[PDB]
Short mmCIF file of C-alpha atoms in Angstrom, two decimals:
data_model
loop_
_atom_site.label_atom_id
_atom_site.label_comp_id
_atom_site.label_asym_id
_atom_site.label_seq_id
_atom_site.Cartn_x
_atom_site.Cartn_y
_atom_site.Cartn_z
CA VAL A 1301 49.54 138.44 75.85
CA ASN A 1302 50.36 138.91 79.52
CA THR A 1303 53.78 138.80 81.17
CA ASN A 1304 54.01 136.01 83.75
CA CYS A 1305 57.31 134.27 82.93
CA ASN A 1306 60.20 135.22 80.70
CA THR A 1307 60.02 135.35 76.91
CA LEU A 1308 61.87 132.04 76.61
CA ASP A 1309 59.34 130.22 78.79
CA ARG A 1310 56.38 131.85 77.04
CA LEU A 1311 57.79 130.88 73.65
CA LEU A 1312 58.47 127.30 74.74
CA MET A 1313 54.93 127.07 76.13
CA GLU A 1314 53.16 128.56 73.09
CA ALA A 1315 54.14 125.72 70.74
CA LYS A 1316 51.83 123.04 72.10
CA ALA A 1317 49.82 121.83 69.06
CA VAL A 1318 46.94 124.28 69.22
CA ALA A 1319 43.52 123.45 67.80
CA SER A 1320 42.87 123.59 64.07
CA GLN A 1321 41.23 126.46 62.18
CA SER A 1322 39.68 124.69 59.18
CA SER A 1323 37.62 121.65 58.21
CA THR A 1324 38.71 118.21 56.99
CA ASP A 1325 35.48 117.27 55.25
CA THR A 1326 34.53 120.14 52.93
CA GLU A 1327 36.34 121.16 49.75
CA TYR A 1328 36.28 124.93 50.31
CA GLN A 1329 38.24 125.26 53.59
CA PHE A 1330 35.40 126.73 55.62
CA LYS A 1331 35.67 128.10 59.14
CA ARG A 1332 36.48 125.80 62.04
CA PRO A 1333 33.41 123.81 63.13
CA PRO A 1334 32.50 124.76 66.72
CA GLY A 1335 33.20 121.69 68.83
CA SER A 1336 35.58 119.89 66.46
CA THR A 1337 38.47 118.77 68.67
CA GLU A 1338 41.58 118.13 66.58
CA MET A 1339 45.04 119.44 67.39
CA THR A 1340 47.40 120.52 64.60
CA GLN A 1341 50.91 121.81 65.16
CA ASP A 1342 51.18 125.42 63.96
CA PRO A 1343 54.77 126.55 63.34
CA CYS A 1344 55.52 129.91 61.71
CA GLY A 1345 52.34 131.24 63.32
CA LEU A 1346 53.95 132.09 66.65
CA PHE A 1347 56.79 133.71 64.67
CA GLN A 1348 54.46 135.71 62.38
CA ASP B 194 46.81 74.06 37.63
CA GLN B 195 43.47 74.67 39.31
CA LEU B 196 45.53 76.06 42.15
CA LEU B 197 47.95 78.83 41.16
CA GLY B 198 45.24 79.73 38.66
CA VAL B 199 42.50 80.38 41.18
CA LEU B 200 44.77 82.67 43.23
CA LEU B 201 45.27 85.16 40.38
CA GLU B 202 41.67 86.31 40.84
CA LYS B 203 42.16 86.75 44.59
CA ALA B 204 45.46 88.64 44.28
CA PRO B 205 45.06 92.39 43.65
CA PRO B 206 47.86 94.58 42.26
CA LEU B 207 50.60 95.40 44.74
CA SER B 208 50.87 98.99 43.50
CA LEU B 209 47.36 99.54 44.88
CA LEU B 210 47.35 97.16 47.84
CA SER B 211 50.45 98.71 49.43
CA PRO B 212 49.33 102.34 50.04
CA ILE B 213 45.77 101.26 50.86
CA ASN B 214 47.06 99.00 53.62
CA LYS B 215 49.54 101.68 54.71
CA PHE B 216 46.80 104.31 55.15
CA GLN B 217 44.54 102.55 57.66
CA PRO B 218 43.64 105.10 60.35
CA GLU B 219 39.98 104.11 60.66
CA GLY B 220 39.02 102.23 57.48
CA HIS B 221 36.61 104.80 56.05
CA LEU B 222 38.05 108.15 55.00
CA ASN B 223 36.52 111.52 54.24
CA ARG B 224 36.57 113.10 50.79
CA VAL B 225 39.80 115.03 51.43
CA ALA B 226 41.79 112.03 52.65
CA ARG B 227 40.27 109.95 49.85
CA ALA B 228 41.42 112.42 47.19
CA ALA B 229 44.92 112.60 48.68
CA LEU B 230 45.10 108.80 48.71
CA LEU B 231 43.91 108.77 45.09
CA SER B 232 46.69 111.13 44.01
CA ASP B 233 49.11 108.86 45.86
CA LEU B 234 47.72 105.82 44.03
CA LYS B 235 48.09 107.48 40.64
CA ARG B 236 51.66 108.60 41.33
CA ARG B 237 52.53 105.10 42.52
CA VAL B 238 50.94 103.15 39.67
CA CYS B 239 52.47 105.42 37.04
CA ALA B 240 55.94 104.63 38.41
CA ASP B 241 56.30 101.14 39.91
CA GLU C 1205 41.62 107.55 16.16
CA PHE C 1206 41.52 111.31 15.63
CA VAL C 1207 39.61 113.91 17.65
CA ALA C 1208 38.98 117.51 16.66
CA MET C 1209 39.99 120.40 18.92
CA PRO C 1210 40.60 124.16 18.70
CA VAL C 1211 43.92 125.33 17.31
CA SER C 1212 45.04 127.52 20.23
CA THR C 1213 44.93 124.84 22.91
CA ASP C 1214 47.04 124.80 26.07
CA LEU C 1215 49.99 122.59 25.19
CA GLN C 1216 51.04 122.24 28.84
CA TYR C 1217 48.02 119.99 29.35
CA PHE C 1218 49.48 117.25 27.14
CA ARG C 1219 52.77 117.18 29.07
CA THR C 1220 51.39 114.93 31.83
CA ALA C 1221 49.04 111.96 32.20
CA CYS C 1222 45.95 113.54 30.66
CA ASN C 1223 42.45 112.55 29.59
CA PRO C 1224 41.58 112.48 25.86
CA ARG C 1225 37.94 113.51 26.31
CA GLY C 1226 38.81 117.02 27.49
CA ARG C 1227 37.18 116.80 30.92
CA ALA C 1228 37.97 114.47 33.81
CA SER C 1229 35.21 112.01 34.69
CA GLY C 1230 34.65 108.70 36.46
CA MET C 1231 33.02 107.26 39.56
CA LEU C 1232 36.08 107.90 41.75
CA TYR C 1233 34.75 111.37 42.71
CA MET C 1234 31.74 110.78 44.96
CA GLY C 1235 30.87 110.68 48.65
CA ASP C 1236 27.26 111.71 49.17
CA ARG C 1237 25.06 110.75 46.21
CA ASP C 1238 24.96 108.10 43.50
CA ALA C 1239 23.52 110.54 40.92
CA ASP C 1240 26.86 112.29 40.44
CA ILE C 1241 28.59 110.13 37.82
CA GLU C 1242 26.00 111.69 35.51
CA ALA C 1243 26.56 115.08 37.15
CA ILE C 1244 30.28 115.22 36.32
CA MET C 1245 30.06 113.83 32.84
CA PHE C 1246 28.43 116.62 30.78
CA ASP C 1247 27.26 119.38 33.18
CA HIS C 1248 29.09 122.52 32.06
CA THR C 1249 27.56 124.87 34.62
CA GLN C 1250 30.32 123.97 37.10
CA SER C 1251 34.06 123.96 36.56
CA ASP C 1252 36.11 120.87 35.78
CA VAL D 387 71.19 105.59 70.86
CA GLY D 388 73.88 107.88 72.19
CA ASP D 389 74.66 106.34 75.58
CA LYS D 390 71.25 105.11 76.74
CA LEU D 391 69.12 101.97 76.63
CA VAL D 392 65.87 103.28 75.19
CA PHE D 393 62.83 101.23 74.27
CA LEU D 394 61.75 101.19 70.63
CA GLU D 395 58.02 100.64 70.09
CA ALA D 396 55.82 100.91 66.99
CA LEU D 397 52.38 100.08 68.34
CA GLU D 398 50.20 99.49 65.27
CA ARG D 399 49.31 95.77 65.33
CA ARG D 400 48.94 95.01 69.03
CA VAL D 401 46.62 98.04 69.25
CA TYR D 402 44.63 100.22 66.84
CA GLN D 403 43.89 97.09 64.81
CA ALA D 404 40.48 96.33 63.29
CA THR D 405 39.12 99.30 65.22
CA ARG D 406 37.55 102.62 64.28
CA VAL D 407 39.93 104.61 66.50
CA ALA D 408 42.36 106.74 64.52
CA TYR D 409 46.01 106.01 65.24
CA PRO D 410 47.72 109.03 66.83
CA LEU D 411 51.13 110.45 65.84
CA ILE D 412 49.67 111.43 62.45
CA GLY D 413 49.08 115.06 63.38
CA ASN D 414 49.05 117.87 60.85
CA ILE D 415 51.18 120.96 60.28
CA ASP D 416 49.96 124.33 58.98
CA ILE D 417 52.31 126.18 56.62
CA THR D 418 51.63 129.50 54.88
CA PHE D 419 52.99 130.85 51.60
CA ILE D 420 53.31 134.35 50.15
CA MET D 421 54.10 135.46 46.59
CA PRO D 422 54.17 138.83 44.80
CA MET D 423 52.01 139.28 41.73
CA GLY D 424 52.48 142.59 39.92
CA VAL D 425 55.76 144.07 41.11
CA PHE D 426 57.74 146.10 38.57
CA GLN D 427 61.32 147.00 39.51
CA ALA D 428 61.57 150.65 38.43
CA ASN D 429 65.31 150.71 37.88
CA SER D 430 67.32 150.85 34.66
CA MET D 431 70.23 149.19 36.47
CA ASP D 432 67.96 146.32 37.53
CA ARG D 433 66.16 145.78 34.20
CA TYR D 434 69.00 143.94 32.48
CA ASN E 1109 22.26 99.98 77.72
CA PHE E 1110 24.56 99.51 80.70
CA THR E 1111 27.40 102.01 80.90
CA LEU E 1112 30.77 101.40 82.56
CA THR E 1113 32.70 104.35 83.99
CA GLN E 1114 36.10 104.45 85.68
CA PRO E 1115 37.78 107.64 86.93
CA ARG E 1116 41.53 108.13 86.82
CA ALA E 1117 44.09 110.84 87.49
CA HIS E 1118 47.61 111.79 86.49
CA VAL E 1119 50.42 114.20 87.37
CA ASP E 1120 53.89 115.07 86.08
CA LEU E 1121 56.69 115.27 88.64
CA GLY E 1122 58.84 117.29 86.26
CA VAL E 1123 61.27 119.86 87.61
CA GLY E 1124 61.88 120.55 83.92
CA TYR E 1125 60.78 118.91 80.68
CA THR E 1126 60.50 115.13 80.41
CA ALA E 1127 59.11 114.38 76.92
CA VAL E 1128 60.01 115.68 73.46
CA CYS E 1129 58.15 115.40 70.15
CA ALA E 1130 59.52 115.94 66.65
CA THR E 1131 58.01 115.72 63.16
CA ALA E 1132 60.22 113.10 61.54
CA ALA E 1133 58.63 112.25 58.18
CA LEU E 1134 55.99 113.72 55.88
CA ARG E 1135 52.99 111.86 54.48
CA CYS E 1136 50.75 112.90 51.60
CA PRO E 1137 49.61 116.54 51.50
CA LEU E 1138 45.97 117.10 52.39
CA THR E 1139 45.07 120.55 51.06
CA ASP E 1140 45.50 121.57 47.43
CA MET E 1141 47.83 124.37 46.32
CA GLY E 1142 45.32 125.60 43.77
CA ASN E 1143 44.31 129.07 42.59
CA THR E 1144 41.05 129.85 44.39
CA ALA E 1145 40.34 133.53 45.01
CA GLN E 1146 38.40 134.84 47.99
CA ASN E 1147 34.93 136.27 47.39
CA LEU E 1148 34.27 139.26 49.63
CA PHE E 1149 30.54 139.26 48.79
CA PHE E 1150 30.01 136.65 51.53
CA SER E 1151 29.82 139.36 54.20
CA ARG E 1152 27.32 142.06 55.10
CA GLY E 1153 27.51 145.24 57.13
CA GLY E 1154 29.43 147.65 54.94
CA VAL E 1155 28.12 150.89 53.47
CA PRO E 1156 26.50 149.90 50.16
CA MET E 1157 26.20 151.90 46.97
CA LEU E 1158 23.32 154.28 46.33
CA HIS E 1159 22.10 152.26 43.32
CA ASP E 1160 21.04 148.63 43.64
CA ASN E 1161 21.63 147.83 39.97
CA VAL E 1162 25.25 148.90 40.47
CA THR E 1163 25.95 146.39 43.23
CA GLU E 1164 23.88 143.69 41.50
CA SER E 1165 25.88 143.96 38.28
CA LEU E 1166 29.03 144.13 40.40
CA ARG E 1167 28.25 140.86 42.17
CA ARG E 1168 27.22 139.26 38.88
CA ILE E 1169 30.52 140.21 37.23
CA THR E 1170 32.45 139.02 40.28
CA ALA E 1171 30.65 135.67 40.19
CA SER E 1172 31.52 135.43 36.50
CA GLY E 1173 35.02 134.02 36.23
CA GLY E 1174 35.19 132.27 39.60
CA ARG E 1175 34.36 128.99 41.31
CA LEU E 1176 32.85 129.75 44.73
CA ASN E 1177 29.96 132.22 44.67
CA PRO E 1178 26.90 132.94 46.82
CA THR E 1179 23.64 131.30 45.83
CA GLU E 1180 21.57 133.49 43.52
CA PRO E 1181 18.26 133.77 45.47
CA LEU E 1182 20.34 135.45 48.23
CA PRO E 1183 18.42 134.13 51.27
CA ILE E 1184 18.01 136.86 53.86
CA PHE E 1185 19.08 135.80 57.37
CA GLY E 1186 21.28 132.93 56.26
CA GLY E 1187 24.87 131.72 56.10
CA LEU E 1188 25.31 132.38 52.37
CA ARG E 1189 26.90 129.06 51.56
CA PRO E 1190 28.16 128.19 48.07
CA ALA E 1191 26.47 125.50 46.02
CA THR E 1192 27.82 122.02 46.70
CA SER E 1193 29.56 120.67 43.61
CA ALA E 1194 30.23 117.02 42.79
CA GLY E 1195 33.26 114.95 43.80
CA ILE E 1196 36.73 116.37 44.43
CA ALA E 1197 39.79 115.58 42.32
CA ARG E 1198 42.99 115.87 44.35
CA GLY E 1199 42.25 117.41 47.74
CA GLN E 1200 40.57 120.26 49.59
CA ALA E 1201 41.03 123.59 47.86
CA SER E 1202 42.77 126.41 49.72
CA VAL E 1203 41.67 130.02 49.38
CA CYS E 1204 43.94 132.96 48.56
CA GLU F 98 30.15 63.00 48.66
CA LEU F 99 30.75 66.17 46.66
CA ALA F 100 28.42 65.67 43.69
CA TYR F 101 25.46 66.19 46.06
CA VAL F 102 26.52 69.13 48.24
CA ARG F 103 23.96 71.37 46.44
CA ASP F 104 25.14 74.79 47.63
CA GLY F 105 26.74 74.19 51.00
CA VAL F 106 28.47 76.84 53.10
CA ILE F 107 30.98 77.15 55.95
CA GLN F 108 31.49 79.78 58.64
CA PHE F 109 33.38 80.56 61.84
CA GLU F 110 33.49 83.27 64.50
CA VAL F 111 35.97 86.09 65.11
CA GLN F 112 35.35 89.41 66.85
CA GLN F 113 37.14 92.73 66.77
CA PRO F 114 38.47 94.44 69.91
CA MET F 115 37.90 98.00 71.07
CA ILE F 116 39.14 100.60 73.53
CA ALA F 117 37.66 102.88 76.19
CA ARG F 118 37.77 106.68 76.16
CA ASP F 119 35.84 109.58 77.67
CA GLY F 120 35.06 113.20 76.92
CA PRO F 121 32.71 114.89 74.44
CA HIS F 122 32.22 111.67 72.48
CA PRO F 123 29.70 108.82 72.76
CA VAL F 124 30.46 105.69 74.74
CA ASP F 125 31.85 102.62 72.99
CA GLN F 126 30.18 99.21 72.72
CA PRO F 127 31.62 95.80 71.81
CA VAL F 128 30.64 94.53 68.36
CA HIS F 129 30.53 90.89 67.25
CA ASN F 130 30.59 89.88 63.59
CA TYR F 131 28.98 86.91 61.86
CA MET F 132 30.00 85.95 58.33
CA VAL F 133 29.53 83.01 55.97
CA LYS F 134 31.62 82.13 52.91
CA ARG F 135 29.92 80.26 50.09
CA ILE F 136 31.40 77.29 48.22
CA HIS F 137 32.31 77.39 44.54
CA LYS F 138 32.45 74.16 42.56
CA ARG F 139 34.35 73.23 39.40
CA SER F 140 34.92 69.92 37.64
CA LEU F 141 37.87 68.19 35.98
CA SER F 142 37.67 65.98 32.88
CA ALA F 143 40.23 63.90 30.98
CA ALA F 144 39.36 61.86 27.90
CA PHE F 145 40.53 58.41 26.81
CA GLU G 98 38.46 105.23 95.80
CA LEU G 99 38.96 107.50 92.80
CA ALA G 100 35.39 108.83 92.81
CA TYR G 101 36.15 111.13 95.77
CA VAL G 102 39.52 112.90 95.55
CA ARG G 103 38.63 116.63 95.39
CA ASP G 104 41.84 118.24 94.13
CA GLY G 105 44.70 116.09 95.37
CA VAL G 106 48.10 117.75 95.42
CA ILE G 107 51.80 116.86 95.50
CA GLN G 108 54.77 118.88 96.69
CA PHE G 109 58.56 118.85 96.49
CA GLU G 110 61.34 121.28 97.36
CA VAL G 111 64.78 121.98 95.90
CA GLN G 112 67.98 123.65 97.11
CA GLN G 113 70.71 125.43 95.19
CA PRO G 114 74.46 125.42 95.90
CA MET G 115 76.46 128.63 95.91
CA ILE G 116 80.09 129.40 95.08
CA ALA G 117 82.38 131.61 97.16
CA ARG G 118 83.65 134.46 94.99
CA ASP G 119 84.90 137.87 96.11
CA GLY G 120 85.77 141.20 94.56
CA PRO G 121 83.39 143.85 93.22
CA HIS G 122 80.47 141.41 93.27
CA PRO G 123 78.17 141.58 96.31
CA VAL G 124 77.92 138.65 98.69
CA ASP G 125 75.48 135.80 98.06
CA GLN G 126 73.18 133.76 100.29
CA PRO G 127 71.81 130.22 99.90
CA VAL G 128 68.34 130.10 98.38
CA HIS G 129 65.60 127.49 98.66
CA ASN G 130 62.53 126.86 96.53
CA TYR G 131 59.08 125.41 97.19
CA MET G 132 56.72 124.13 94.49
CA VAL G 133 53.37 122.35 94.63
CA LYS G 134 51.43 120.76 91.76
CA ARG G 135 47.84 119.57 91.50
CA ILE G 136 46.40 116.33 90.16
CA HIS G 137 44.50 116.07 86.87
CA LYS G 138 41.26 114.09 86.69
CA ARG G 139 39.79 112.25 83.71
CA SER G 140 37.18 109.51 83.34
CA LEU G 141 36.85 106.54 80.98
CA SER G 142 33.62 105.12 79.61
CA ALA G 143 32.28 102.09 77.73
CA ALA G 144 28.88 100.67 76.78
CA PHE G 145 27.12 97.32 77.18
#
């Protein structure tokens, strides 16, 4: 990460429903298909 | 008697018609969404 | 009707809505091929 | 609500009806879980 | 096949924030909270053992007692995908 | 004249709407539907 | 004429009031701000 604004602004800007990291068709939770455009909200990922 | 007796074959069970109608994003669903909806249907029909 | 079964059987299986045959089956698990109701009815090379 | 005159809209019948477009506002949420497996508390004061 | 195209543009005149979203309710879960282990034999590049029978028996034993496993012929220069089973019961399985 | 209809049928016309989007997805085309609903026949008898 | 815009912009400025306080704190001076935003382009497509 780079420092451009303060930590509060960076944190408020991170949570913006990033793209998914799985598949919604297979039954084994494979890797994300390249090109699949679906946005899922990812809490507790920016907090580690 | 012909009426009110013909409609029983057209009427499906409410316990199944309700969640099916509720989950109408695009009509056809993938295997994952279909399985989730099936678990919902079982839970519902066992109870109501 | 009575069905035979081993003596040391998981009792937790009978605590919910179960299937008497011992393995789940049916046509409700499909999505690509019609020759799968015969696949998941006796094939013991894959898990339940 | 509070002290404002807000609109209250539930667009599901005027739009996204009899169409193949998926209705938005049904986004997903990714949650993770962690559990210990073989921990043994090596303490006589704790094994009670 | 005629095609009809119309360009448009937008902008937010926000000195601060103007819209808020919140997850109100929860619908049915999608993934399954099952017990599916992760098979590390899906990758290549590590330093292998000096005896091929060792690693072959190792992979065989690891495939025994699991659900997802690499296909037996082991196609060189491939993706090493597991064999597609039949229909799913209650949702997509999640690895551990 | 209903004892001589000899497998008649009735039909009408309704079409489904659609929307317009752009991006990494194919263009959308209007679709019209044509359906017919057959006629079932039953009789009524009362003795004397 | 939306086909030819080539990065349209918009601009607005803001001022900030100050309060007269004295003591150990150093003196203040009125401050002004200047911000400029760009436009975002997106097409829409349909078939026939």
